Every structure is written in C-alpha cells, then in structure tokens.
Amino acid sequence: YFQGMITEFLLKKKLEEHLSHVKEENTIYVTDLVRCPRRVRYESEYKELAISQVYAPSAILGDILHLGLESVLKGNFNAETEVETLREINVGGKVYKIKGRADAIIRKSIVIEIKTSRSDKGLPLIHHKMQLQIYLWLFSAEKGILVYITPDRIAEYEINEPLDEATIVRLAEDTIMLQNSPRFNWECKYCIFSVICPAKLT
Amino acid sequence: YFQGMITEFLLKKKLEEHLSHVKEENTIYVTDLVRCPRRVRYESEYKELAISQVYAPSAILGDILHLGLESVLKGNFNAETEVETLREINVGGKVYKIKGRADAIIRNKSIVIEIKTSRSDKGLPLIHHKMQLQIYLWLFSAEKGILVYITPDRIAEYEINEPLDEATIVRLAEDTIMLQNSPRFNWECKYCIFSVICPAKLT
Amino acid sequence: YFQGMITEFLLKKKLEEHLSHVKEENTIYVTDLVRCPRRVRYESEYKELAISQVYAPSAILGDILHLGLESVLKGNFNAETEVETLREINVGGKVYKIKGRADAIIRNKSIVIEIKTSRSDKGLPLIHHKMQLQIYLWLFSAEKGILVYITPDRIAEYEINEPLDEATIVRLAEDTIMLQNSPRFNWECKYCIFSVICPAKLT
Amino acid sequence: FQGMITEFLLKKKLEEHLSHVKEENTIYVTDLVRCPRRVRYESEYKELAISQVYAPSAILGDILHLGLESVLKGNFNAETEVETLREINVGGKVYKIKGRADAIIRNKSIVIEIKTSRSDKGLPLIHHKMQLQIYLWLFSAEKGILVYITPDRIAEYEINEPLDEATIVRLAEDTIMLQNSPRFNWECKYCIFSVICPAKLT
Amino acid sequence: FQGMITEFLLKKKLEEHLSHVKEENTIYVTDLVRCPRRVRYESEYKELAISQVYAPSAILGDILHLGLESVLKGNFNAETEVETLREINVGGKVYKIKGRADAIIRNKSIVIEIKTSRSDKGLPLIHHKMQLQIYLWLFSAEKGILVYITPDRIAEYEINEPLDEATIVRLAEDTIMLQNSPRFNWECKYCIFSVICPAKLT
Amino acid sequence: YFQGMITEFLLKKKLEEHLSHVKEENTIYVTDLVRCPRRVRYESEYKELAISQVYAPSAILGDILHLGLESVLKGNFNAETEVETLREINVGGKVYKIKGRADAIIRKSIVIEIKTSRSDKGLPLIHHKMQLQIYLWLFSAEKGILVYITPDRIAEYEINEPLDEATIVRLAEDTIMLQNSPRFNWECKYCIFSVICPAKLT
Amino acid sequence: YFQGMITEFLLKKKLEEHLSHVKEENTIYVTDLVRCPRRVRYESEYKELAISQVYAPSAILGDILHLGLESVLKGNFNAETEVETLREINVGGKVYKIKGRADAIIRNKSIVIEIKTSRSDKGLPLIHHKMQLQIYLWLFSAEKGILVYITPDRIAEYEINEPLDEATIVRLAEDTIMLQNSPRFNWECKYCIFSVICPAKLT
Amino acid sequence: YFQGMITEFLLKKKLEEHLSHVKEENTIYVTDLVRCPRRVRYESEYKELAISQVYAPSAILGDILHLGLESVLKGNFNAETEVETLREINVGGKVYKIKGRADAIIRNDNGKSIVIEIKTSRSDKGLPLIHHKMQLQIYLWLFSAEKGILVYITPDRIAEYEINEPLDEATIVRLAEDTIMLQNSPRFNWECKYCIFSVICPAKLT
Amino acid sequence: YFQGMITEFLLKKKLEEHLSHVKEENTIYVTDLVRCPRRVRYESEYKELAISQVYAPSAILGDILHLGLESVLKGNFNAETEVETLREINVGGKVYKIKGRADAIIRKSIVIEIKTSRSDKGLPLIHHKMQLQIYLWLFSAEKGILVYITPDRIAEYEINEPLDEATIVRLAEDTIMLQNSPRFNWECKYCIFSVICPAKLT
Amino acid sequence: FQGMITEFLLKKKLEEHLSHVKEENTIYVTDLVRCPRRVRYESEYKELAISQVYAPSAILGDILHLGLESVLKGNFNAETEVETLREINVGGKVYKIKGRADAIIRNKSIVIEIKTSRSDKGLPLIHHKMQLQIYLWLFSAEKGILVYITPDRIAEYEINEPLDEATIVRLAEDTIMLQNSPRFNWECKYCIFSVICPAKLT
Numbered sequence A, F, I: 001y002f003q004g005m006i007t008e009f010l011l012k013k014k015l016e017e018h019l020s021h022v023k024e025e026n027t028i029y030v031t032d033l034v035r036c037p038r039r040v041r042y043e044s045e046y047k048e049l050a051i052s053q054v055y056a057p058s059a060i061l062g063d064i065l066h067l068g069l070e071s072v073l074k075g076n077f078n079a080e081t082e083v084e085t086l087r088e089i090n091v092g093g094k095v096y097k098i099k100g101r102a103d104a105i106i107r108k109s110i111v112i113e114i115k116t117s118r119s120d121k122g123l124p125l126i127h128h129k130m131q132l133q134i135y136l137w138l139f140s141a142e143k144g145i146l147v148y149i150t151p152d153r154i155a156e157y158e159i160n161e162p163l164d165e166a167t168i169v170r171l172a173e174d175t176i177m178l179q180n181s182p183r184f185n186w187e188c189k190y191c192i193f194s195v196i197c198p199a200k201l202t
Numbered sequence B, C, G: 001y002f003q004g005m006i007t008e009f010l011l012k013k014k015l016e017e018h019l020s021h022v023k024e025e026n027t028i029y030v031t032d033l034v035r036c037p038r039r040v041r042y043e044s045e046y047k048e049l050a051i052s053q054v055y056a057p058s059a060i061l062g063d064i065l066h067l068g069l070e071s072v073l074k075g076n077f078n079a080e081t082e083v084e085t086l087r088e089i090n091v092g093g094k095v096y097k098i099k100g101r102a103d104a105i106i107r108n109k110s111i112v113i114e115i116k117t118s119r120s121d122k123g124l125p126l127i128h129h130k131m132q133l134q135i136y137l138w139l140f141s142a143e144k145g146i147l148v149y150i151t152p153d154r155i156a157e158y159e160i161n162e163p164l165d166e167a168t169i170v171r172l173a174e175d176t177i178m179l180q181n182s183p184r185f186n187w188e189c190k191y192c193i194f195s196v197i198c199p200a201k202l203t
Numbered sequence D, E, J: 001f002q003g004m005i006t007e008f009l010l011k012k013k014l015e016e017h018l019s020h021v022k023e024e025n026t027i028y029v030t031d032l033v034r035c036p037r038r039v040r041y042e043s044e045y046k047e048l049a050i051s052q053v054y055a056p057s058a059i060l061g062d063i064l065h066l067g068l069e070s071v072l073k074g075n076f077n078a079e080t081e082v083e084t085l086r087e088i089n090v091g092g093k094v095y096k097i098k099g100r101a102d103a104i105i106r107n108k109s110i111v112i113e114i115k116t117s118r119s120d121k122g123l124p125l126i127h128h129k130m131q132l133q134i135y136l137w138l139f140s141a142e143k144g145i146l147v148y149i150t151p152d153r154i155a156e157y158e159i160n161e162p163l164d165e166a167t168i169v170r171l172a173e174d175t176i177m178l179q180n181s182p183r184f185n186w187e188c189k190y191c192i193f194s195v196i197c198p199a200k201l202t
Numbered sequence H: 001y002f003q004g005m006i007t008e009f010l011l012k013k014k015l016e017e018h019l020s021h022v023k024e025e026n027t028i029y030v031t032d033l034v035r036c037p038r039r040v041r042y043e044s045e046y047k048e049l050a051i052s053q054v055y056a057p058s059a060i061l062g063d064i065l066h067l068g069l070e071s072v073l074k075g076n077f078n079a080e081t082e083v084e085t086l087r088e089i090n091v092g093g094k095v096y097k098i099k100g101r102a103d104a105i106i107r108n109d110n111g112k113s114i115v116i117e118i119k120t121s122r123s124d125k126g127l128p129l130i131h132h133k134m135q136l137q138i139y140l141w142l143f144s145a146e147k148g149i150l151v152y153i154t155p156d157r158i159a160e161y162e163i164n165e166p167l168d169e170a171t172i173v174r175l176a177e178d179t180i181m182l183q184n185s186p187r188f189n190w191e192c193k194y195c196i197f198s199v200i201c202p203a204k205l206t
C-alpha cells in the first residue's frame, strides 16, 4: 500500500474504534473528570477536529502496548480486560451517568490501570492516580494497581483509597459548568483545540 | 508486594525467556551479524553480566509492543509469529548455522515483518535494522519484507524486498567469528554493558 | 456561547468550504503541483485527518486577508476574483486536467494576481509561491503576474512574467502521480500533519 | 517602481489619514488607553505622525478588518465602522469622546471589536478590553465582543460591563493633563516619538 | 510640552527640510553614494521621508557642524556650506550633479568634510571617502580632508585623489536606472522605506 | 585472549568472591544499615541482576587498593585484615545478627576503614563515618580510622565515638520494614535497580 | 599633516583653554560638588597627569556640541552664555566661595540651561546632572531650570525647578573639603584617570 | 597524630623510596626516554624541588594499586614483581646503561616471557596512550621479551592491551640522544601543564 | 647554561635563604600568626615539601621588588630595612616568643609593610592589615604603612591601630591548638599541603 | 593624602621622565621596536605623553629592575644602565642610534635585558628579542640574555645573533618616514594616543 499495509490497517481499526463510541447526552466518562472541561466539551462540539487524535503516534503506541500487556493479565492473573460499567450520581439535582472502562480487573477485587509516558519523571502523576481512585469507586473495588511502562523505567503503585462521591460530584459540576480550565497547566501544550480556545494558557 | 504484583511477574517471565535461549557452538544469530563482534562474544563469555539486559525497561517495553502488534497480525493477516529457522553457511572451511527468528511471517509468497520501537524517529530506517531484515529474506527465502517502527513521534513503515547475497552474509559472519571490526557502529559503545571491561570501547 | 458567536460561524463556514471540494479523477490542482506528492495523496486518503487543516489559524487569517484585499481589487482595478479555469496535458500516456483558482485577474492583455500572507518577510519572494504563479500564467495564458506579500514586518510586491514551460509542468505532474521528489521542499515536513505516519518525513 | 498593488494601498491609506483631522477638544477612545504624551505628539508633530500610515502591520490589520467586516455585514446583520460621539465635562471644558466601532449588531445591541496581533500571548490584552468597555458606554450597548485573529490562534471574549462615566473622565483627565506616560511599559519600544520624548522608558 | 529648546531645534530642522527644492534633473552628491531605490522613495514618498528630520543622530551632527564652523571661519578662513552644481552626460540626456561641502579653503583649494559616528570602527568608511572624492571633482579641488569626531576617537584623513568623471557616470546611471540596490549591504537595516521595499535585504 | 589474560582472572575471582557471600535469613550487613532499604532487598530478590555490580570498574579499582593498603598495614603495623565478626540484636522482639567485616584492625584496638573516591569533595562522607561508627560497636573497638585515597588528596579522619545500640536497632528497623528509601538522595542515580524501582528519585 | 590640520588645532586650543583656568583658594566649583572628592584633589596635586583629560574625544565632541547649541541659544533665545557667579557659604566656621559657570541663562526671570552630551540615552536624566543644575538654581537664585541632552539615540529636555537647600550644599562642600566619601558615585572609578594611584578605587 | 597515623607512614615510606634511587651520570631510565628531556635533567639539577613529586596523591594512589595488583600476579601467575634490569646502548661512541623496572614479569609462559605494565588514571580516554605503549615496547627490548601486556585500571574501565613489538635499538638510540642533547622539549604537548618545573622552564608551552 | 646564568643564581640564592631559617623552640613568627595553623605545622613536619615554595615565581618577584623598593627607603627616608625583633607573650600558662621581621622602619616610629599581587582587588587585604597591626605591637610603633605595588595600581594605606595582646594571644592559641583552620577560606586553594590535609575546604 | 611613599615614587618618575630631551638626529633603540607614530606623538604631544609616567605597570617594572640590577652589580660584576650610541646612515643624513642596556657583563661581553610582564604567554616576545638583537649590534657584544620575571614563571633566553646593519637602517627608515604603523597589531590597544590617531586598528 502507499501508506504501508500494516500502517493502513492500524489507522483504519483506530478510526473505527474512535468512531465507535457515541457519547449519550448525560454520560460523563471517568477520563473526562480529570481533564480540561473545555476540552471535553470541544470533543463533543468539534468532532471532526476531535478525530485527529486518532493519528497521535503515542496513542497508537499506548494501545498496542495495552493490548500486549492485557494479554498476559488474562492468561496468568485470570483478569477481565477492557471492562465497562456505569454508576449514577446526582448533580445540582440532575442524574448523570459516570461511565468508565478499566484496563483490567481481577476477582476481593483489583482494578489495574496501565500507563505509558515517554518520561518517568514524577511517577505517579496525580491525574493518573485520581482516575484510578475514581475507578475504585466506580467498580466498588478495594484495591488498585497503577503500572507505568516507560523507556526509562517500569514502576508499579498500590492505590487503595477510593475517591469520596462528594468530590466526584464536584469534579462533575466542574465538567458540566466549564468552571476551571485547564484542569492542569500542562494540558494546553498538547491540546488540539488550543488553536481556537480562549482559555488557553500562554 | 515488594516489587509489585504485575512487574514481579513480567520480570520473572523475561528472565525465564532469556535463560531459555541456549546458543550452540557454531551458531550465529542474525542479530549478531549486524552488531559488534566483541559484544556478541562477551554475551557468550560473561552470561551472568549479560543477564543484566533482561532488566532494561526499553526491552521490556519493546517486548510488550511486539506481543501486541504480533497478536494483531496473527488475528487479521493470518501471520505466524516468532518464527525460527536455521540455515547453513561455509565460513573459512567450516560449517556454521545462521539462526533467525522473524517477528512475523505472512503467507500471501511470504512477507517477513520486523517490528521496531524506539524513543526517537530520527534517521528512519536505520541501516542495521534494514540489514537485519534483508538477511531474514535470505534466511527464510522470502520475497518481500516490511520494517515497521512504532515510536512516540511517528509510525513509519518501509518495504525491503531485496535480500543480502550469501557472500556478504559470509563476510559479516567472518567478522563475527574472527572479531574483526569492533564496534560495528560507532554508536554502540555508549549503551554496551561491557564497555566497562572492553579495550576497544570508543571514547 | 461556548466557542463564541463569531468564531463559531467562521469555523462553520470554513468547514463547509472544505467539505465542498469534490476532487474529480485525473485532476491535479496547481496548489497540489507545487507541494509534496505524498501529502496530496495523504489528503485524498485520510480525509478525516485532513479536515483538521480547517482549524489552522494561519489559514483562517490568510483567508480573511484574501477577502479583505479581494473586495478592493474588484472595486478599483476592475478584476475578477476567485477565477477557476483548467487545462489538459498529456502525462506519459494519460490525459490529466490541471485546475487552478487565481486570487484575482485584471483584464486590460491579462494580469494574474496571487496574494500571500506570511508571518515573516524573510526570503521574499518564496520559490514555491513564485512557481505557483508561473504555473498560473501558463494555465490562463497570461503574460504578466504579480505576487503580493502582506506581512507584519513588510509589504512587498513582485513582478513575475515568465510562465513555466509545459515540459516542466509535465515533469512536475509525473512527480505528483508517481510519488517522486517527496518532499518538494525540505521545510515542508515540519508543518505537515501527516508527518506522524509518513515514512519519507525528513528528520 | 513601487508596484501597482501596493502603490494603490499606500495612496488610499495616506488619504484616509489626511481626511480625519482631529478638532481641538476631541479625544478618540483609542487615545484614552494609549500614552498621553503619544496622543499629544500626534497632534503636535503631524508630519512625523504621518509615518504611522506606513506600518505594515497597520495595513495588514486594516485589510483584515475589511474582509472580516464584510462577513459581519453579509451574515450577522451588522453595521460596520460605526462613528458616534459623546461630550463630557473635563474641568469645565467640553471634550468630544469620539469612537469608531468595527461593527455593531442592533438586535438589544452588541459592539464587536476585532484585533490582529502577531502573537496570542496574554489574550485578552487589558487595553483592548478597556477600549471595548468604553465603546459600550459610548454606544450605550449592554454587550460586547472582542475577537482576535492571530497566526497562532483565534479567540473570542465576551465583555459585558461598560466603564463608569467617572472612570472615563479620569482617563480623559490623565490624557489632556499628560499624567502617567507611558500608560504601559511596552509602548516606547514601538513609538515613533521616542527619539524626542523625555519620558521614554529605557 | 516637548520642551522649549527641542521645539525650536525641530521646528527649524523641519523647516530647513521642506525648503530644499529639488529640480527635475538633479542628483545630489550624497545620493550617488546611496541606495538608488532609497533616493527614489524620497521623492515618491516625501510625506514618509519627512520622518528622517527627527533622526537624533542627524540633529546632533548638525549641532556639531554649527559648533565647529566658527573655528573653520575664524582660524582657517574657510567658507562653510558651499553649494555648487556641475554637469555630466548620462545616456545622451544631460544631468546636474549638485553638492554641499561642509567647508572649503581657497589658497589650490582644500575641501573638508566633517563626520560624527557613535563608533570609530572601520574609519574612514568607504562611502564617506567616496563622497569626499565626488566633492573633489565637483569643486575641481586638489585636496580633501575627512575628519571624524567620535566619542572613542578623533581622526583625520587626507583624501587627495578625485573620482574620474567616467566613474561618476556609472553612479549617476545606477541612480537613474535603479540598478544596484541597496548600494551597501548595511543600508536596509536603518532604512525607513524597508517596510514597503521589495529589495530589502533580509 | 579475548578479554585479556589479566582481566579474565580478576573478573573470575571477583565473581566467585561475590557468589560466596550467601546471607542467612536473620542477618543484616553493617553496609546495609547505611544504604537504601529497597536496594538491600533488591540485592536479595534479584540476585541475577545484582551480579552486575561485580563488573563496576570502580569496585575493581577499590578492591585492588584495599588489597595494597591492607598489605602495607599488615607488614608494618601488625594488623589483621578482612576481619569478620557477628553480633546479635533485638528488633521487634526478633533476633537478627549484624555482620561486618573490617578492612583492617590494629593491636586497645583500632578499626580501619579504607575508602577510595574519584573525588575528595566533602570528606568525610556521613555514610562512611556511620559505617565506621557501627564497626566500633560491632568489634567493641575504641578507636576508628577512616582513610581516603583519592586522586586529588589523601585524607585521614579519627572517628572514636561508636553509634549506640538503639541507633543501630533503628537503622535495622528501616532496613527490615523498608521505612525511608532512598536513605540518601544521591543513591538512585547509580543504583542498578532504579530501572524497576517505584521510589526512584526523579 | 602629521596629526592633521584640523585636529592639531582643536587639540592646541583645547590645551590652552585647560591651562586658562586656575582655581582659587577657599573656592569650590559646582562641577566639583558633584564629583569624587579625591578626584578633585587629585586634579590640583597632579596637574601634569590631569592634563591627559584634554585629549578625551568625548570631551572634545562635548565642547564642540556645547558651542553649536550655545550659538543657537544666544541668537534665538537672546541667551547669555558661560555665566560666572558666586555665593558664600559657611563650613567649619570658615568661609568658602561656591563658584560656577552656567552654560546658558535665559530670561522671560531667569532660566538656567545645562547642556549634556552622552553616548547613550540610558537613565535620563542622570541624577548627578540633575544635581548640578539644582545647585546652579541656588547659586543664581533662579526658580526655573532646563537640562537638555543631545545623544545619538535621543534628544531629551527636562525641566528641573527645585533648587537644593543650602544645608545640602554645605554637606556636599564638607565632603569635598574633608575628602570624606569617595567616590561620590560608584561608576566614577571606572573612568577616573587617577584610579591607578588611588587607594580608594572601587574594585 | 596531627597528620594521621596511616598518612604519616605512607608519606615517610614514599620519600625514602624516592631518595633511595640516586642516578648515575651515564644511566638513562626507560621512563626517561618517554618524557621531556628538559624535565629529566631538571630532576637531576633541582632535586630538592623534584622531591615534591613524592606527595602527588595520584602517585600514592598509583603505587598502592601496583602493590595490590602485583600481589595477585605473584600468586596466580608466578610473576616476579618490580623487576630491575639493565641493558647497554651506544650513543655518539659514549656507552650508556639503559635501566628499567618492570611492574611484573612472567619468565616462562609456554616458552615466552611476558612483561606486564600496569597503569591507572582517572579517565579511560584514548586508551592506550602512546607514551605508555612506548614504555612497554622499550621494556620488551630491555628484557628481550616476546610479549607485553599493558593493563589500565581506571574508575570508568578496566582495559588490557597486548603489545608484542619491541622498539628497534635505533629508535631507542634516537630517544636517548634527545634525552641527552635536550633536543625536543616537551616530548608531548600535554606535559608542561602538569610539570612542576614549568615555573622556571623557558620551553614551557603557553 | 641549562637553566640560565641569572635564574640559576637567583634560585641558588633563594634556596640558601630558605634553608638558613633555624626555627627556635617556643617561637611563632608574625607571618605564621596570620595563616592557617595546620599549614604552619605542615611546614615544620614536612620541610622537604615546603622547599617547593622556594620556586614560586611570584615569591621570587616579590623578593626582587622588596629589594628594589627597600633600596629607595634607606636612601631617601633613611629607614632600617629587614629589621628583626621579638617579644614574649603568655599563652594559657606557658611563655612563647612572637618574632617579626618588618620590611622597613622609620624612626616616634613608622613600620612599612610592602606587598605585591598580580591584582589590585579588595585592597587592602585583611590578612595584610593584620600582619601590620601586629608589627605595631611587636615594635611598639604608633604608625604603619601598607604599600601595594600591583600592575594595575599602586596604593598605600595608613594603619595606626595595633592589635592588643588579648587578640594576639588568642591568635597564638589557634596556632598552638590547631584551631580556626584555615584562617581564611581562600587559603586551601593555594596551599601545597591540600594534597594530604583532612581539613582542606572543598 | 596620596600617601608618603607613593608621592615620592611618582615625584621621582616624573623628574626622570622630564629629564630625557632627545636631540635632533637621534633614535632610541626602544623606538626602533615600536610604532613610528607613537614615537612621533611622544615628541609632538609631550604634555599627554607624561601620562605614561603614571602607568603602574611601568612603576612596578622600574622597582623591579632596581632590585635585580643590584644583584647583577654585586654577583656578576656587571655594569647597570649602560648607555651608548652609534651613528648610522639613512637617506644621506647621519643619525645617532642611542640605547641603554639594563646591564652588561665584561669578561668578551654579555648584554642583559630584563623584562616584566603580568603574563608568561608567548615568551620570548619577538620585539623584546629584536630590542636585544639591536643592543648586540650597539655594543658590538657577542652574547645576549633576555630574562623575564613574571608571576607565573621565570624564564631565561639566550640571544646571540646581532641584528643586521642594513635592516637596522630599514627600521630607522620607517621610524623616520612613518612608513608602517603600528609595528605590531597589539600596540593600539594600550597606546595613549589611540584617542587622536587615524592609524589605530579597530
């Protein structure tokens, strides 16, 4: 192929996967709760532009790697991979659904979140920890492992404290009400919506 | 858990896999033909030091990506993966076995696929990776080859369809056996675990 | 307003003008002719990714300038703006159409006006801009063109009068068709949105 | 010699300068957020002030206002380049606070100011905000929009609170009374009067 | 407002600039050692050209000649500010090469040029020498004295060979046909026409 | 000889020396009490990786220096070299042996600890001092000497106060229960387990 | 012709002007209340060395520019130039005279003009300059003063209208006489010609 | 012990060793042949200053390493250590005794003598250094040995080189002539920087 | 001449003068009082290494200067040069004699200390000030002059307050008990015993 | 006020300098090795040249020849400050090449020249060497010693080849005609007459 046969295939499967998930009206993904609110909303308001995230090479790397590593978790830890669930909360009155997909779960029960930075500075990153903390709440699990596979180091962290629904709720209204953007100062640097976004840190 | 439940396991398996590859006396790996001769012989003389390679996180990351990208190939292109073959050559007046292991092979005619990962997409494709693949095309008598890099800055795929001819494999082999030009590439010494005892280290 | 009443509308109108470029087969636009062949092909093959060029602020800005300076050229030089034509050439065996849209043509005798913005006034006139206009001379059978730069550090105008010969246009069209000379200019890969998947990317 | 297109742009731009001739007691809204000494110098050294006509970023900004303004007319039902004025007492004397709004949309009303900047640092710039808050008073609008078209980014801000009449008076006091020059530390770097000005920041 | 002294110096400087009336067919000596495109801009965009009047290094230079010229008149018995023109033939058409010498001494005469620079680097600079050598042929003089007063050093050079009338032709030609612009590669950096000039070195 | 006749021998004797020291379950080395508790536990959980330490050239230099300076001591100060001893302590009500080996002991006894660094910066280093102070406790010796042989300086320090047994017990607790890792901020930088350790300083 | 016709003369006349003034006993000049006390004493003790100040091209440029600007001041403002005067002050129960020479004075009441020339327009107006003029306002009992700079980057005029109070002048005078706090300004030693023998040089 | 017990003893023993070796008017050490001639003569003419080189901590470090590594060599390889020997050379019809002391010798390893020279430095840059190899090659002539090993123990690297060609006698005579006639000083460019005689030497590179 | 006729003689002469300083028993020079006490002690325990100081070229230059300048002080100020004297003090129970040698003295009495340096920075240097304040006490002089001949500056300083015994005694204390080592933090950088000294500052 | 010793030294240097009147057809040897214009300037601008007297470099250099020269009279039985002249023939006229040797040793005769410098870089400097080569001719001596006393090193050089008469005359030729200024490119950087000289290098 002019792109290359393997390249063409991975890009084609990754686009179909990205197109796969239409988000319901009142559903908030776990991953959205720990990202910039404007970014989340842009993903919904500017889907055509949002599609370019499919062609991010570190994303493709990360997916192949979750696939690699998830195989071994199935076959030695008897784990469930890519496990979805919902759980409701009420926000300013309205009922919102919080939707998450865990990289792996083990059945007490263990949630496993796999990450791959290109750098091992500062591990574990607060936003990766929060995410996992929220999945603990989501799946009502007692134990969490956050495991980083980076070129400079492999490191694994036990995270066992779930986030309190009270803060989950307040992370939620911050997402719905676009209250504080960006969520972390580093987000704008890599954000594809910074070309049009008024809130962009400069 | 001291090291971690997950990483304890990956380390255990990777140590196991490393110890499982025993090399015969007159056998040269394809990967040996495109790297420093002294390094190849140190890996045979100082195996207890060579074990330290098992723990290089880039190798662990690299092994997990092969496992992922290999399962996608097996699933959607009807590829065999981790395929071994041997082939004999005469070097000097003596028979050696060249052994290789393809990351994946596809039966259309056959296509040898070599997966590569790195932190950098600089200089792609690297000459020593292309040689590796060109040698596998002779080893497997295969018609076509794909070298595909998965790196954080770029996914890049190259088509290598020309095999190295046997006389040049023989000459690569001669270097290997007789320690002729060490290192093979000037960048190697910097990452070599043997540089600390090696007189030919570039400085 | 989430994005903002005015910006919402500009991005909406620019998305639609983008999506309305139904590309007919055997048709090569002048602006494709002077860019990297693989990039043109990437644009036809990964349209979902290519749409992201819609949101380039330099393109929105450049368009607005074009509109700005275009209203003036209509009402004072009596020119036609956004003027589409096409012309057939014989490339190898096959017959291809070269299509173009001049920014402005004043008639008197014809003059083709190409307007450019840029962040920098360094190196004016740029050789790809020049080439593009020299191709528009041939395409509209004009004998005079003007390249005008509106930059923050300078306003500069250039009289470009020699059209490109058909043989050079043909030689360029080959490269587009058979993916040769990628990239055309070494600076291109730096700003190419396909650099993340292209194996020919300069590094 | 100079070039057909640009010889025209410069001619046409000189005439638009030479046409507006500021009466004795007129202050432009743009003068209230500039350096008072610079305002005064433009009045006192009009042969030198002419040199501003040929700033290439002014020509660019003017071409952009044109293109964009014609889009505001065509699709938003807006009036472009809307002149108005308002008189005020600054210590017994009557001053004309004159202003030209880039565009207005009357249905009950919205002032839009368009800006072109070489970069997107610091958006919205406070002098630009203030200028817009002056126009809301000037044109008695309840709403304004500040829109930036820069090579790095497009962004848009909703400014809804007009400046107090008193504050505008104080601004005019500082303007005629030459009180705090420059108004901002970046001004002198670009000012054509720095070669004769004693207040120049070094 | 500007201050009592500077007002006067500038009004007088301005008025001396608007006085210089350039006849159709006349090229200045100083124009022969400058960028052909630059002297043309000066007649085509006079309103912009007026900003040179406010170049502080020019004011300072003037003030210098003023101070120095009592010395020249009293003790050297020279005429200062000596205007003259001469006729050359270029392209069959015939031109007036006109010049103003800082100071002349008739005895066998010696023309003298005075320069200020912030810097004594490279003295004498080649376009100053070239200038003196055109005043030598203009005034048909046998001796020239170029003298620099810089803050780093005072320096004086004897230029006693004039340019050949033949040479002067190629340079008046350059100036009319706008051939080699800019004449010296350092000109564009300081040129007030660089903002609209397509030949600007960049 | 591929490696070299002399080097092959040194690396064979180092490796066999390193393989000879197997640790019993309730035994802590004196060197362990002044190092990172995690690193200590890595050296016993990842013995195959730990073996790479045998090939650190600075260790080989160090050992040969010890051997040389050990021989001088023996033949002119009637010292015993490489003296091992063992003393028992109570931790969490359990019995551990602290085991150590002094480079040399003289005659009233003096424990000598020899160090070689490639730099004389900051001597004596706190962790080297503690080691020695522990050997005083261990050998119930009354004097300690810490001598550094570096390429920039020879420096000798008299250290005669032992660490009390309670400090030793505290150090042993940290070691058993991985309390504070790394013990010293500079450790991670040179630790062969950094590549798999979650506590690595970054 | 060795040195040059013009410069030879300029140097000759500058030298004479230097030797033309000899300082009175119990007299302090204003120019000296604003300079380092040791330097002022050095100028009496080491007149042969002090004479090198004559050849300082900055001073030459400086004198010429005072001449030209003065010429304009006296034929258009009807200014008096180089106006000498004195006042008496008590210091140490002893009587001293402060003397000075205003560059120009102009009427309306009197305006003291001080002219300055500097290489750079940095930090205008420099505090010591301002100080000099304030002392002249007290000396001439003038109520209004103009400091005017002619630099290559900029022309800048300042109205200074407060005179220094008499106590302060006395203090400046005490320092001058008792050599108390030298240098007066930290930047002085860098240019002082006596830095080579001065114990107090800042270093 | 104000200086310290161990330090005091090493310094005392090293000054003794240095002072034990008085050099005769017609001998040339091997070590001299690969050094600056002016410096070698300075070591005879300014012996009081020369003595400061005793207190160079790299040299004390260096000698302890030789001691310790040498003791390995006497055990497992049956080497002699610090082996002194002498060989004569003609230079302008004057006869000269070239004298050297090899760090270790293996007299008979399968019908071969091996001279071993041990070296230490703080960096492994550029190994092996040409003046080290020359020194080993002169010993090879001195002992008439067939094999040479130059081994570097450095903090970055251990590295061993097999050097088997001895310098011709003519080359050694050329080295000797320069030593005697003070011909080309310094011998190597990096010398003066470390040379304790640079403070009085006119040939010092700047 | 291998070394050279003149330098040979100079070094010969310098070595002789260095060697001819027989150090009496309970004796501390003034020049030792102002330096690190360990350095003083090293100079007494390692005579052979201290001899290298004889070949410091700045000390040779130093001595040639003192000679030349001292010839002027006899000649035109009728002063005694290289004047020697001592004076007992009492240190905590014992009796030591402080001994000094002043560069020049003029008889009331003026002690002159002459100093060179390649740099005039920070003059006068406190340790030179201290040396001379001690001379005034040793010689019962009332006035002192410190004169620096340096390539950038000649500078002379009047020092008229001598140190009292209490402080001199306290300085001798340090010299005896090896306290306050080094006295000044720049000393180790130049000290030839830093190669063996444990208190070297690093 | 300036200091007792300092005053005397500067007072004496001044007198010394002021003594030396150069007669009409004379050229010092030290003038043959210098810029011709500087030698000329020292004649035509005497007042300025007196500033050379206050060079601290030179005062140090003087005090230094005094010390060393008193060793030279007293151990090598030499003549310090030996003055002589020799007539040469240039352009028909007869000139007196005077010179003063720092010292001479009379056995068969040796000229000694002492130099000071704050740097030992590049010894021996070519122009110090020429100076001694001309002195060998002047005194017709067979041997010469150039000796430097710098603070980094003492270094002695033996110079025996006396300079040619023909090229001595070619030097005087340029001294007279101002043929090549400066002689050496480093000269202008320390020249007191660079402030008024048109030859100065920049």
Ligand code: SF4
Binding pocket: G036, G037, G038, G039, G042, G182, G183, G184, G188, G189, G190, G192, G193, G194, G195, G198, G199, G200, G201, G202
């Ligand atoms: S050097 Fe500094 S202190 Fe000494 S006189 Fe000149 S200015 Fe005053």
Ligand code: SF4
Binding pocket: I036, I037, I038, I039, I042, I181, I182, I187, I188, I189, I191, I192, I193, I194, I197, I198, I199, I200, I201
């Ligand atoms: S090193 Fe520092 S401390 Fe040790 S002696 Fe020399 S100076 Fe005193």
Ligand SMILES: [Mn+2]
Binding pocket: A066, A103, A113, A114, A115
């Ligand atoms: Mn994950």
Ligand SMILES: [Mn+2]
Binding pocket: C103, C114, C115, C116
């Ligand atoms: Mn265009």
Ligand SMILES: [Mn+2]
Binding pocket: F066, F103, F113, F114, F115
């Ligand atoms: Mn030890």
Ligand SMILES: [Mn+2]
Binding pocket: G066, G103, G114, G115, G116
């Ligand atoms: Mn003035």
Ligand SMILES: [Mn+2]
Binding pocket: I066, I103, I113, I114, I115
């Ligand atoms: Mn002294």
